Amino acid sequence: TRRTIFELRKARDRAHILEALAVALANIDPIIELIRHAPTPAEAKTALVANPWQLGNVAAMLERAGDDAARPEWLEPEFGVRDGLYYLTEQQAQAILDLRLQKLTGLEHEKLLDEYKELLDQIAELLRILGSAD
Amino acid sequence: TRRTIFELRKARDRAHILEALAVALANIDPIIELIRHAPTPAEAKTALVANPWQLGNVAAMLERAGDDAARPEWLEPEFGVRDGLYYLTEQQAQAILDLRLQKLTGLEHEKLLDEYKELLDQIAELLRILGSAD
Amino acid sequence: SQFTLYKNKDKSSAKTYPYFVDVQSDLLDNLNTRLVIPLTPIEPSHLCPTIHIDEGDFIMLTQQMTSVPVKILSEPVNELSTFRNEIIAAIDFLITGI
Amino acid sequence: SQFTLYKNKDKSSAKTYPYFVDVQSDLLDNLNTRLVIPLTPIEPSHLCPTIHIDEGDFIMLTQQMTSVPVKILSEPVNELSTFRNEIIAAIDFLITGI
Ligand SMILES: [Cl-]
Ligand SMILES: [Cl-]
């Protein structure tokens, strides 16, 4: 414990960013359309947050853990996975805008999903460690 | 001088990278499709180099200087503008792969084209300054 | 903290480099070091963003970016998150040439 | 030159930091400084790539990246461009959290 809470938090914080990237890659066609239509980075970020995104392949991955296990405790209820859609925070939209094109290639996409999947398993175990005395 | 050459060389070097990005932006739909299809970054680079690209609006920009005025001296003839088509180097392909999604927004796109245009102006000027005594 | 501006306490260099900005992602705050960029008073725009804040007017010397011990970050005075895009673009320029 | 590996000539630090890699774009070679990343012998994977080369087995300490005078890049021994992807990814993680 205490070490456990630190670990769980760090895993969720990292998973939270990867989750947004994975959702973006699952919707890359309309994501880039939306970005190209935006006159500025600020407006692209606003447009990314304005409407939710379909989960696509991420839906199946979330089955690797109980409901909302990857969700940071500090995340407000209006964000994250909600009824089959994903509601991005501004920080997540900024991570999407910071993706390099090379990240779209098959192996880079798979590597990102591999890290996110591994984190979900890591998170579920850290949770299981709790676990402890009530 | 002996320093006019120095400036012309670095204007051409910077313009060479921006020119690849300009050609990519003029072809953004097929560029993205190519990169997504590629199973690896190495294969994306290969595919980017392997086929000529339409100049689009870059052809009109190239009128801001003489024929091949922005072409680096070290650049092999198999690369660059050949018969109205653009032949990228591996280094140029990597620059395209290094682009962040945020560079596709309207103002970021325009800022890149404006610097490319500015360099074409500088280059064309540094050229005529050469001559000067023979 | 990412984009937090810190007062340089080393009296020797504090005159030319009075402040520095943490540019390290908060996901790595477990590290005992921070990547920072020094600011210098205005006494290449793409590499060295000009910074106008309440503390004064500075050039961000992105090429003099360096890693420092986290204990050096004891005196936060401002935050530069509105400059995020300029700062990242300058770092990208230094490394990828774009 | 970008991705060239240089020998650390400082006897006091050469044991723990035998080499450093230039990660600065060649388009900025006019600068009198270079952004470099030190290597340390093996004896956070995404942040600190493992580097197996003829010189030995190292970890790139991306977080300890620093700006150095160009004059100390006097002894190049290798070239790490096949590691470009890993190097850029590590820097992106350090700064953008990607
Ligand atoms: Cl809502
Ligand atoms: Cl302010």
- Catalogue the E-assigned strands of A1-134: 53-54, 80-82, 85-87
- From residue A79, give the alpha-carbon distance in Å to each of A45, A84, A94, B20: 15, 12, 15, 39
D96 vs A28: CA distance, rounded Å:
19
B77 vs D42: CA distance, rounded Å:
45
CATH code at A81?
Answer: 1.10.268.10
Q: Which of B8, B10, B90, B103 should we substitute to test contact with D (largest number of D Cβ atoms within 10 Å)? A: B10
User: Assign residue C3 a region: left if phi > 0, alpha if psi is -120 to 50, beta otherwise?
Assistant: left
β-bridge pairing C4-7 and A80-82: unpaired
A119, B53 in Cβ contact below 8 A?
no
CB atoms within 10 A of CB D72: 15
Structure solved via: X-ray
Domains of chain D: 1-98 (2.30.30.110)
A114 vs A120: CA distance, rounded Å:
10
Contacts of residue B94 in chain D, CB cutoff 8 Å? 84
Q: Which amino acid is at B92?
A: Q
Portion 50-89 of D in contact with C at CB < 8 A: 63-67, 88
Which domain, by its residues, includes B2? 1-134
Question: Does B102 contact A41 at a Cβ distance shorter than 8 Å?
Answer: yes
- From residue B97, give the alpha-carbon distance in Å to each of A17, A97, C96, D62: 21, 14, 10, 21
Q: Return the residue of D nearest to A116 by Cα.
A: D98
b/e sequence B101-122, b meaning 16+ C-beta within 10 Å: bbbbbbebbeebbebbeebbeb
Helical segments of chain B, H only: 4-26, 28-37, 41-50, 58-61, 90-97, 106-129
Q: Rounded to the nearest 5 degrees, what angle is found at the Cα of A100, between the Cα atoms of A97 and A102?
A: 145
Question: Could you identify the residue written with the tokens 């994250």?
Answer: A80
What does the DSSP assignment read for A15-46?
HHHHHHHHHHHHTHHHHHHHHHH-SSHHHHHH
- Catalogue the E-assigned strands of A8-132: 53-54, 80-82, 85-87
**Structure-block tokens of residue B66:** 């003489």
Task: Return all residues near B98 (Cβ < 8 A) that are at least 6 apart.
Answer: A100, A101, A102, C92, C96, C98, D88
Task: Give the gap in angstroms from C-alpha D62 to the nearest C-alpha of chain C.
Answer: 10
Considering its fold, how many domains does chain A have in total? 1
The separation between CA D36 and the C-alpha centre of its own chain, rounded to angstroms, equals 5
Task: Return all residues near B112 (Cβ < 8 A) that are at least 6 apart.
Answer: B18, B21, B22, B25, B103
What does the DSSP assignment read for chain D?
-TTEEEE---HHHHTT--EEEE-S-GGGTTSSEEEEEEEEE---TTTS-EEEETTEEEEE-GGG-EEEEGGG---EEEE-GGGHHHHHHHHHHHHH--
Binding-site residues on chain C for chain A (CB distance < 8 A): 27, 30, 84-85, 88
